[PDB]
């Protein structure tokens, strides 16, 4: 077996049926314009070299066999400092079916880049993307696919949401091509549609602002002859407004 050559080299195009099971949709960092997501990134592909016939039909093995055989060099186009978990052992599974099909699942914590247009912040919704594909192999050599229907190929665990100020409405997937001077590369994209929960900002900036303006309008009921009281009423409210604005900008990049 040669680890350096893809299956069916020179005769076929290696089709990899990928799939994502979102174990937990991690917190969204608006400051870094990125989001964390822990997944069971599964890939499946046919390799005629790894065809056997024995007492068992499927060989469930560990990562040691995964390192010994060819696996797709899938990388996330907008990934930023992802980690493949290693405790206790490399969190990977390899399963060689007797026909030659491989099922290679890995547990990942991918910190993908999500460019956000914060024009309507905090009443804003963002379609955070997750695009992945082969790095070294062009569309003529490695093509990706969804193992199930595209709608049913990115499953999110029910009690997995780690979002604090966001609501995962859903996800939508697609497949496309990236043009490059190096070549044409097949890309699998999935957009997670998040909607920011305004609850925190209502009681952190909106309520203080409304109470401050009502406090300033309280001065219209004080007698005009009380100059120090209404003067401090006004100046303290304006200074509070400046502090509120400055402390509201720091919540965003």
């Amino acid at each position: 077996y040669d680890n350096r050559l893809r299956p069916g080299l020179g005769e076929r195009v290696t089709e990899v049926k990928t799939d994502i099971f979102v174990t937990s949709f991690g917190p969204v960092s608006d400051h870094d314009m990125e989001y964390t997501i822990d997944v069971f990134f599964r890939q499946s592909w046919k390799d005629e070299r790894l065809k056997f016939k024995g007492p068992m039909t499927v060989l469930r093995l560990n990562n040691l066999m995964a390192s010994k055989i060819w696996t797709p060099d899938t990388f996330f186009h907008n990934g930023k400092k992802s980690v493949a978990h290693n405790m206790t052992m490399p969190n990977k599974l390899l399963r060689i079916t007797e026909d030659g099909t491989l099922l290679y699942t890995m547990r990942l914590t991918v910190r993908a880049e999500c460019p956000m247009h914060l024009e309507d912040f905090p009443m804003d919704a963002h379609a955070c993307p997750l695009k992945f594909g082969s790095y070294a192999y062009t569309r003529a050599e490695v093509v990706y696919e969804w193992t199930r229907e595209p709608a049913r190929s990115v499953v999110v665990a029910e009690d997995g949401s780690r979002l604090n100020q966001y609501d995962l409405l859903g996800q939508t997937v697609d497949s496309g091509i990236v043009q490059s001077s190096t070549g044409e590369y097949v890309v699998m994209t999935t957009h997670f549609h998040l909607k920011r929960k305004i609850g925190y900002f209502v009681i952190q900036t909106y309520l203080p602002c409304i109470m401050t303006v009502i406090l300033s309008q309280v001065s219209f009921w004080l007698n005009r002859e009380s100059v120090p009281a209404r003067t401090v009423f006004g100046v303290t409210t304006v200074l509070t407004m400046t502090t509120l604005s400055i402390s509201a900008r720091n919540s965003l990049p």
Partner: antibody, heavy 117, light 105 residues
Framework: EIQLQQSGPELVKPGTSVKVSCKAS????????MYWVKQSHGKSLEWIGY????????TYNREFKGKATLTVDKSSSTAFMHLNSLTSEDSAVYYC???????????WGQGTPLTVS | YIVMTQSPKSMSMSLGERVTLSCRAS??????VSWYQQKPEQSPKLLIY???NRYTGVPDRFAGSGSATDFTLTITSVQAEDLADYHC????????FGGGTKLEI
């Protein structure tokens, strides 16, 4: 090349089950799912269900859930659809389609007209 | 499921002119919207896969287009062989098909 040959047309009384075959020869049978589509005369194509031949894993439409049963013979490389409790509306033309990938159905079946009276 | 709507139920156009057949998807379908050609008493034939990708063996006059829910199949010059029933189907979710546009003269 790829050729999907289906069983010839037949007529059956209402309430009597019937099976329709789909033989593939060009490609390796277990690599791609086999879908079944019903088309009544003058109406839109309707999806019944599909079978993953390697493990025989089946998924059915809600309307045809229980009306149709999908089976497979890997050795003969044939996909079988079994319709039971046939009614008047079940008379239609049935095709078997081969789904190359998530995008398109590559090769369709020739067509098995079904009539009840 | 996703319901596909074919706006032109039956289009009547002469030979050698541009014709566009529309297709609407109820929900998001991405680029998983294929077009099929079905002559009378014949099985469907795939013409356009993806959203605009032309299937092999298809004349260059056929051209698909569409991003999310609006999809169009355009014939630059209708030939005598281009008179058949045209269906649009989505494979993003469980497969469904539209009513089927028929081309006439």
């Amino acid at each position: 090349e790829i050729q999907l040959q289906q069983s010839g047309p037949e007529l059956v009384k209402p309430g009597t089950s019937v099976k329709v075959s789909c033989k593939a020869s060009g490609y390796s049978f277990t690599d791609y799912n086999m879908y079944w589509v019903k088309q009544s005369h003058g109406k839109s194509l309707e999806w019944i269900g599909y079978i993953d031949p390697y493990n025989a894993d089946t998924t059915y439409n809600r309307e045809f859930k229980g009306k149709a049963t999908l089976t497979v013979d890997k050795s003969s490389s044939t996909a079988f659809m079994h319709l039971n409790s046939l009614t008047s509306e079940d008379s239609a033309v049935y095709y078997c389609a081969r789904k190359r990938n998530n995008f398109y159905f590559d090769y369709w079946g020739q067509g098995t007209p079904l009539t009840v009276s | 499921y996703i319901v596909m709507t074919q706006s032109p139920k039956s289009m009547s156009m002469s030979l050698g002119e541009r014709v566009t057949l529309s297709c609407r998807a109820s929900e998001y379908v991405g680029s998983y919207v294929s077009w099929y050609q079905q002559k009378p008493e014949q099985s469907p034939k795939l013409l356009i896969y993806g959203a605009s990708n032309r299937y092999t063996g298809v004349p260059d006059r056929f051209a698909g287009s569409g991003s999310a829910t609006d999809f169009t199949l355009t014939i630059t010059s209708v030939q005598a062989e281009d008179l058949a029933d045209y269906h649009c189907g989505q494979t993003y979710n469980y497969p469904t098909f539209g009513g089927g546009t028929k081309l006439e003269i």
